[PDB]
Amino acid sequence: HWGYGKHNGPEHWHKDFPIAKGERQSPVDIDTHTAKYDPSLKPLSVSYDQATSLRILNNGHSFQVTFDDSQDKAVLKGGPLDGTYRLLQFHFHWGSLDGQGSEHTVDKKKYAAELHLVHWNTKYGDVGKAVQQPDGLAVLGIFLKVGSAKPGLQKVVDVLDSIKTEGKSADFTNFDPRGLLPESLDYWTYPGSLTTPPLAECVTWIVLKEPISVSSEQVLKFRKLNFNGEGEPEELMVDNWRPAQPLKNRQIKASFK
Ligand SMILES: C[C@]12CC[C@H](OS(N)(=O)=O)CC1=CC[C@@H]1[C@@H]2CC[C@]2(C)C(=O)CC[C@@H]12
Ligand SMILES: [Zn+2]
């Protein structure tokens, strides 16, 4: 029922999901001059060597690549986190044009897209239990700008024609998400929420400062996806981003000076 359109988009979500107006909603604008360098923050530990990708899916609001999260094979630790978080899936948010698409903003700058790697805290045993906890999930966010191609994204790009419409899926084995990461793991962090319904306030956000570059041809393939199901009126899957929400009583911390 919810979506990104005039009649069902972000300004409507609070009717079905009243936490949309909560105290720790995401995304936010990252004011780089106000973010506090925290010398107590640890380097982020990203251990993706044993990742097992399974499927690629058009879920009607994004596409996602899903991983085997039945063991500690692709995990996030350290940084602001206590304990071990298993990679469940990654997905993107993007625009109709290159000047919008990201969910987080940096000094009000919007990037062309934003990559989210979604992880859940193994102390809660499954992701459904983790979304009911304030420290249940850790989402690693990476900005995309348009310039040079990202070679590690091309395998994703090339299968999108097979999942054009909602609920369509394909095998997507042996994909290495290390090929989507920038050089630096410098980050901002704050407590927030899922950025789609149910908008649960369960996420430690970790947003990398360094964007990756993707080519215009790569992001144009994102924009050929459809929000609609097969045979329904064709509505390009573009502008699937929630805008920045009020920071309220939160501090954004920087891992770097
Ligand atoms: C897929 C989605 C929503 C979109 C979120 O995107 S974002 N942008 O916040 O990372 C990532 C995310 C995490 C947990 C997942 C939830 C939808 C509902 C699920 C499946 C449950 O019922 C239990 C786990 C829940
Ligand atoms: Zn997301």
Give the domain CATH number at 141: 3.10.200.10
Which of left, alpha, beta for 59 (phi over 0: left; psi -120 to 50: alpha)?
Answer: alpha
Q: What are the φ/ψ torsions at residue 152 (nearest 5 degrees)?
A: -70, -15
Domain count for the chain = 1
Range of the domain at 112: 1-257
CA-CA-CA-CA dihedral for 2, 7, 12, 17, to nearest 10: -20
Q: Measured from the CA of 203, which atom of ligand 1 is nearest?
A: 9
Q: How was this structure determined?
A: X-ray
Best residue for ligand 1 mutational test, from 116, 118, 195, 204 (most atoms within 8 Å of Cβ) = 118
Active site residues: 61
Residues whose beta carbon lies within 6 Å of some atom of ligand 1:
116, 118, 127-128, 131, 139, 194-196
* Residue type present at position 76: L
- Ligand 2 ion: residues within 5 Å (CB): 116
Best residue for ligand 1 mutational test, from 19, 127, 140, 207 (most atoms within 8 Å of Cβ) = 127
Reported structure resolution in angstroms: 1.0
CB atoms within 10 A of CB 127: 18
Annotated binding-site residues for Zn(2+) read 91, 93, 116
